[model samples]
Target: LIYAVGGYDGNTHLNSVEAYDPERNEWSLVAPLSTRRSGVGVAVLNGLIYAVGGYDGNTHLNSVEAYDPHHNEWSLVAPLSTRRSGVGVAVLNGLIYAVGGYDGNTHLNSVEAYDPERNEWSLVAPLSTRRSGVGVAVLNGLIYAVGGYDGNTHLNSVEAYDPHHNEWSLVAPLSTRRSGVGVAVLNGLIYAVGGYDGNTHLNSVEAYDPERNEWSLVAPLSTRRSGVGVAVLNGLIYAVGGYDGNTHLNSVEAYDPHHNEWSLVAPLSTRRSGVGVAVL
Candidate 1:
């Protein structure tokens, strides 16, 4: 099952949570988040879905929450040092890293790592450029921070963080700039999905191969999207709710690397953009 978390629904910030069962081709409402969150960063570690910082409509947030699937409940966890919306989060070597985002006053370059064992957050090496709406994924032990908007413009540049060295190095950039992109790892390749490129919402998709240090275009999605929630489930990469150029979306699609194509799947009941998704 894939869990779709809080996001804006064109009306208000949402606390609703829904789970899609691929077997049933249906979405069922789950326990809602404790607070409304849009542009939230989500990752799964030790079987828990960690929902990181995002805007609650009133303000940018630093609070973090973890959902216990077995209990079907969400509880507060240690928060990040910086209030962030559009933060990129992923797990690496047992640590959950929260990358660059908007802090209300300025775009942020600072990063933080959460240690679940100790229930604390610590600062990590900052990104070279301030990023909001960034896409992050772990590939071959290194964390990749994909395209996002700097304060001035959308970026195509990519960077990788080495926990061993605690540094970031430039990687081959995306051919097209993307912010609010959805990223996931599949069969040794990192897929970067739809997002805004400053000019418009995008349907273009690309994959990065670490072995070659390169990015190559793949079949595009049928619907343009930004702030899409992406997750890999049983060899298929699922792209969930997101914002198309004009409206919040309830559409869902999945990519099949074997066929190099995207096909429609059961969508969420409520329209959502900036939703967070994780496989449970």
Candidate 2:
């Protein structure tokens, strides 16, 4: 089960959530979000769906909400410590980490960790780079934050956060400097997909191996896009909807490690960007 959260619909923001089932290769509409927003971050914790900071049409919001799939209902949760948009979120060791994002007018490097047990958020070590539209994932207890946009430039720099010591350290940079990329951990390696460089939308992909502290280029995506949502289902990494240079796209593609290749899968129902996906 994978739930894709709200994103831009080109002209306006979206409130709908699309659920994907790998078994059927199809998408269905779940309950709509309580508020219409874009650039939101989402994570599944203890069977509950949590959506964090994002932008409505008018302003950046710190509002947080949770969805109960079993009940088909949504409820409010503790708000984020900071008001931001385009944040990256990941769950590690039972804690939720919200990383770099934009605070309306500027990019921010602030980091916050949510403790479900206490229903509170605490400040954490900030990212080395102040950026927005980043992609984050947890692997072997370390949080990896990938490509995103600084105010003037797209970034390829990757950073890792260690909760044990509340510190951040630089990791291998991406092969391409791009923002709005999608990241997923599959078969013990991190795979980053489609994003936009300053000049153009990209179809490139790259893989990072922490054990070796290196990054290697891989097969490019079928379509040039940015702000895609990605997840690893079974052995393959799936890259979902995003925007091309001119238009939003519904195209979806998958990468196979065994073949070092990419193949198109089912496109999303709506063409959007800055979506979040979680697989169970």
Candidate 3:
């Protein structure tokens, strides 16, 4: 099953969740979230899905929750150490790492790790620059924080963190400045897809070679979108629903690196932006 977690459902901050079964070619509504939210960070670990801080339509949130896919239930977990929305998250070395986000008032540079063993969170080394709406992916054993809004400008800067060193350092930047991008790792390369460039929604996609420290535009999406969710499955990259400047989109597309092109796929049941995607 592929889970589409919290985000605005066109009309409101939604607690309703959408689960899609690729094998069956259909979608169904499952258990709703514990709280209504958008821009939530999500990850799968130990056969469960974790939904972290997001906008509650009232304030930036610090709450966290976990869902058991088998049981179809949602439960509150330990809250984050700081209130944040639009955060980027990934699992590295068995820990869920939450990176830069918006704090209701300002862009954040804070980073935290959730330890399931203790049911708590602890501060880790922060990002080198303040950002919100960042894209994060795990590649070559390091967490890469990609383009985002710095409160003043859209950024092309990228940063990488090594768990071994507990530090973040500058890496090759994207060719185009972007915020709210979708990121995923495939075939040892990190891909950053559709994002807002301070002017318009972008369909441009770029791939990064960690070993060579280079960024290259490989292919572009058919539709311009930002705030989409991206993931890799069976060696293909899936880019899901997002904003396209004029309207919220439910269009989904798959990228084929071998052919260097993107093809339209089954879209979400509802228009969405800031949704989280997890494959189980």
RMSD to native, candidate 1: 0.7
Top-scoring candidate (TM-score):
1
Please give the CA lDDT of all the candidate structures.
Answer: 0.94, 0.87, 0.88
Residues 100-147 of candidate 1 have per-residue lDDT tens digits of: 999988999899999999999999899989999999999989999999
Number of clashes recorded per candidate = 0, 0, 0
Top model number, lDDT: 1
- Tens-digit lDDT track of model 3 for 14-116: 7778877667657678998989878888888888899999988888899999999779999999999888788998998889999989989989999999999
Ranking by TM-score: 1, 3, 2
Alpha-carbon runs more than 4 Å astray in model 3 = none
Best-to-worst order by lDDT is 1, 3, 2
lDDT of prediction 3: 0.88
Inter-residue clash pairs, candidate 3: none
After the best TM-score superposition of candidate 1, give how far the Cα of residue 71 lies from its true spot, in angstroms: 0.9
Query: TM per model?
Result: 0.99, 0.97, 0.97
